[PDB]
């Protein structure tokens, strides 16, 4: 099961790009938004872009990129919403949430909060 993560926020696909850039999508036959989530701990994830083989990072700054080497920015807590939304935080970062914008650029970490709908992602099947 890859999956794509659809974000609340504005309706895009999050999207890893093969020279590690991430934003969001709108159409959903990308291949770039084919996800690899694998877990460590119970409720700690790495996400993988299948296609451009990078995993999804948190810098210091809060901007989010994809790095092909997994460091300590590339894992993040999953955790269960209502209504089958899944958000993710920094597991380095801890107050700094997974978020895009309604105009499916990223949302910097640094100014997410847990309410927010930017944060919030359905799992979808690829």
């Given at each position: 099961?890859?999956?794509?993560?659809?974000?609340?926020?504005g309706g895009?696909?999050?999207?890893?790009?093969?020279?590690?850039?991430?934003?969001?999508?709108?159409?959903?036959?990308?291949?770039?938004?084919?996800?690899?989530?694998?877990?460590?701990?119970?409720?700690?994830?790495?996400?993988?872009?299948?296609?451009?083989?990078?995993?999804?990072?948190?810098?210091?700054?809060?901007?989010?990129?994809?790095?092909?080497?997994?460091?300590?920015?590339?894992?993040?807590?999953?955790?269960?919403?209502?209504?089958?939304?899944?958000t993710y935080?920094?597991?380095?970062?801890?107050?700094?949430?997974?978020?895009?914008?309604?105009?499916?650029?990223?949302?910097?970490?640094?100014?997410?909060?847990?309410?927010?709908?930017?944060?919030?992602?359905?799992?979808?099947?690829?």
């Open positions: 099961d890859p999956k794509r993560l659809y974000c609340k926020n895009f696909f999050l999207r890893i790009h093969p020279d590690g850039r991430v934003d969001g999508v709108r159409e959903k036959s990308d291949p770039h938004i084919k996800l690899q989530l694998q877990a460590e701990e119970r409720g700690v994830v790495s996400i993988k872009g299948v296609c451009a083989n990078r995993y999804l990072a948190m810098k210091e700054d809060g901007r989010l990129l994809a790095s092909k080497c997994v460091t300590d920015e590339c894992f993040f807590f999953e955790r269960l919403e209502s209504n089958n939304y899944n935080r920094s597991r380095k970062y801890t107050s700094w949430y997974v978020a895009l914008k309604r105009t499916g650029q990223y949302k910097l970490g640094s100014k997410t909060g847990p309410g927010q709908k930017a944060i919030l992602f359905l799992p979808m099947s690829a």
